[PDB]
Amino acid sequence: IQLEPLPPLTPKFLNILDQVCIQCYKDFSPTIIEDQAREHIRQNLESFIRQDFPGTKLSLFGSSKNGFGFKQSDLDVCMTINGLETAEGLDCVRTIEELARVLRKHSGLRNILPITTAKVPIVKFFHLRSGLEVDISLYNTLALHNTRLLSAYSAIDPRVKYLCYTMKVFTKMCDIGDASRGSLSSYAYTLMVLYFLQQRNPPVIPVLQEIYKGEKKPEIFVDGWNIYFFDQIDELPTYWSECGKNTESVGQLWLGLLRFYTEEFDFKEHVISIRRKSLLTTFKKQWTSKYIVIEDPFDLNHNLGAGLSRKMTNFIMKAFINGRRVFGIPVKGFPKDYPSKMEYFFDPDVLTEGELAPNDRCCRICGKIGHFMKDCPMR
Ligand SMILES: O=c1ccn([C@@H]2O[C@H](COP(=O)(O)O[C@H]3[C@@H](O)[C@H](n4ccc(=O)[nH]c4=O)O[C@@H]3CO)[C@@H](O)[C@H]2O)c(=O)[nH]1
Numbered sequence: 106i107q108l109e110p111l112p113p114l115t116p117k118f119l120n121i122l123d124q125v126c127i128q129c130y131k132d133f134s135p136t137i138i139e140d141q142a143r144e145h146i147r148q149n150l151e152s153f154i155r156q157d158f159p160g161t162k163l164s165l166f167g168s169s170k171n172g173f174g175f176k177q178s179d180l181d182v183c184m185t186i187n188g189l190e191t192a193e194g195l196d197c198v199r200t201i202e203e204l205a206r207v208l209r210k211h212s213g214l215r216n217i218l219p220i221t222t223a224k225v226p227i228v229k230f231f232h233l234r235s236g237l238e239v240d241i242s243l244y245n246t247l248a249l250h251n252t253r254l255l256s257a258y259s260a261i262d263p264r265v266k267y268l269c270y271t272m273k274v275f276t277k278m279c280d281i282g283d284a285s286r287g288s289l290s291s292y293a294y295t296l297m298v299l300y301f302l303q304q305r306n307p308p309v310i311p312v313l314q315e316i317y318k319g320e321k322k323p324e325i326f327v328d329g330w331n332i333y334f335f336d337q338i339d340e341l342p343t344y345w346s347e348c349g350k351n352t353e354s355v356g357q358l359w360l361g362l363l364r365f366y367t368e369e370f371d372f373k374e375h376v377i378s379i380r381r382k383s384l385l386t387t388f389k390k391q392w393t394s395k396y397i398v399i400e401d402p403f404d405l406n407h408n409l410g411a412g413l414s415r416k417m418t419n420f421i422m423k424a425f426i427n428g429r430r431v432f433g434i435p436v437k438g439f440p441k442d443y444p445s446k447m448e449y450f451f452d453p454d455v456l457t458e459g460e461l462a463p464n465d466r467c468c469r470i471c472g473k474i475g476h477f478m479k480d481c482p483m484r
Pocket residue numbers: 167179181182220222223224225227240241242245248283284285286290473474475476
């Protein structure tokens with residue numbers, strides 16, 4: 106597939122692109138009050154569950170803590186039991202079902218649903234007063250660490266946040282950010298942003314998992330994987346020589362990302378991997394089955410794109426190509442004929458050409474993957 110050449114931009118248009126990326130953050134990030142409410146929910150659930158399971162500990166992870174949350178993002182909760190370091194004596198499937206029974210007694214919750222067949226078994230439910238979806242998992246230790254990792258990256262430079270928010274808006278508007286419906290997890294798209302910023306010349310962020318006081322990388326193992334990374338961001342100028350050398354604006358970088366993954370990045374040859382600056386090949390990983398290949402920074406056996414079908418991969422790539430056109434090619438009558446720039450750049454009828462995301466892997470009743478119709482909740 107060949108792509109349209111991009112016309113040269115004016116500074117006036119470049120400033121518009123900058124503003125759109127920043128509005129994605131300002132418009133959709135939670136207020137300080139909404140963040141505190143999320144902590145209050147965790148606190149309330151921990152006390153309620155402790156009535157039946159004393160020593161329960163609930164810990165927030167995901168976008169509530171990694172610096173990239175939206176107002177209506179779900180509440181990702183990790184449950185552990187004090188004194189029990191790992192889930193090696195804990196019966197996780199039976200624990201999920203016991204936990205669900207406890208949560209059905211909570212008058213402020215609705216629609217308790219345990220999902221024990223997923224790779225990560227969860228019990229999810231609806232919190233009435235906040236209107237948020239909550240997902241509780243058991244001993245999700247690695248998720249807690251990649252939450253800290255992403256949070257560290259978000260603190261290095263404000264542009265990290267702006268781009269991750271813009272990416273999250275983009276994929277959400279294209280309806281390609283729901284792994285439960287066959288597309289990619291929003292966490293996978295966050296990794297794509299970070300990988301782009303690491304490979305940029307000059308880089309906007311370093312590879313924190315490769316920064317350390319010499320000579321060798323410290324070895325801190327969790328569930329068989331080294332979770333070390335440099336998290337002393339205040340001292341980063343000392344340990345990152347290229348700190349602050351990239352002076353591109355946010356809009357420049359956002360258009361650069363769209364061009365990077367449509368023109369430059371070789372999906373069939375390389376793996377999107379934020380744990381190392383050196384390119385990682387699909388052949389070295391023996392991950393040639395799929396086109397989009399995304400390696401988790403800690404669980405190196407996890408390919409985030411392992412679930413994508415061929416159709417979904419084409420749909421995703423067409424979205425990025427159309428995004429390249431909308432953000433890169435100024436149009437006549439813009440911006441004076443449009444009372445909202447957000448509605449122009451993120452128009453789904455343009456980015457996906459009016460088509461809906463494919464859903465062939467999905468249940469015909471609810472639209473989720475991973476269950477037969479006799480097991481559907483909406484039956
Ligand atoms: O690697 C992971 C993946 C998921 N999660 C947690 O599960 C929650 C739901 O994950 P999601 O990627 O949106 O959907 C899962 C499952 O919840 C979904 N699924 C699977 C079987 C089914 O019957 N219904 C259903 O919706 O299909 C996917 C299987 O990877 C997330 O919010 C996380 O809190 C994690 O903590 N780590």
